[PDB]
């Protein structure tokens, strides 16, 4: 799987560890061993929600499987509830867009997983 | 709604309120209301349009709903006037992807809109 | 067609010309003009693959067509040998996500290809 954050806060208010802890807590919300989640964090963007600038983030989750109406209601809170402790941004300043991918369309190691 | 550019057009080429401008003028367009619309810009970027490295820009427009063929065309043209205007971004150097999210995929303030 | 590339790689680890090869390279393996390939290049992100902060990126290629079970087999061996050769990156530690797109759903010039 895949997990992507952009946000206005600024790097220095991103925890080192941060990509660990989302990769733990992913790997165990998804059940697949961490090798496989992969992670990434921009920091210090120009947005606005709600035509505000206060801190936000605008996320997406890919992953082959393992999405859906009621695991994408629990990965909500979990993602929420990371991003508020770890970065200071209220839970509704915050959109995950979620991707349930086929294995033809998801590119690895030279190959794809089909 | 959320609506991301990249450009390769420097930050200082970013006219203040723009981000108010997106939020406005989506708002309008896409008949949803401001308090939920998020809007990105990401300038300084290293890309390439047809190999050229002029000012271009990727852009999405992600909604539940409202997207389609007409609606398309009509953002189009709002928005590749706005990066032109605005951005000094020739229209013919424009990508816009757009997606029509189920509500269930769309994750905010711990659930999803489904 | 539209490629985008995401790594921890520094920007100064990136070979002159490397958007060059990369829209020669797409337009030589989907068969369609440079003029209509789009690169973007991000380096320097804070990412990690499998809770590790080694080499990584994270891509997309997206199309009107062209992407397919065996196509996307042959565009992954492609461009994860151009990011092991040009920027350092195992292949293992790749995932580019493939994108079908539906013509009314791509802006460009002010309208759509609808
Ligand atoms: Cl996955
Ligand atoms: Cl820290
Ligand atoms: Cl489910
Ligand atoms: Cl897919
Ligand atoms: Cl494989
Ligand atoms: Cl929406
Ligand atoms: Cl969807
Ligand atoms: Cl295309
Ligand atoms: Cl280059
Ligand atoms: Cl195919
Ligand atoms: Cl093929
Ligand atoms: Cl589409």
Redesign the pocket.
Known sequence: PMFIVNTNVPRASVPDGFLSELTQQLAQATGKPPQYIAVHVVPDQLMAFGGSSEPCALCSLHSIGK??????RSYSKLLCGLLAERLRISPDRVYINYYDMNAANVGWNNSTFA
Not at 67 to 72: P, S
């Open positions: 999405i859906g109406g009621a695991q994408n």
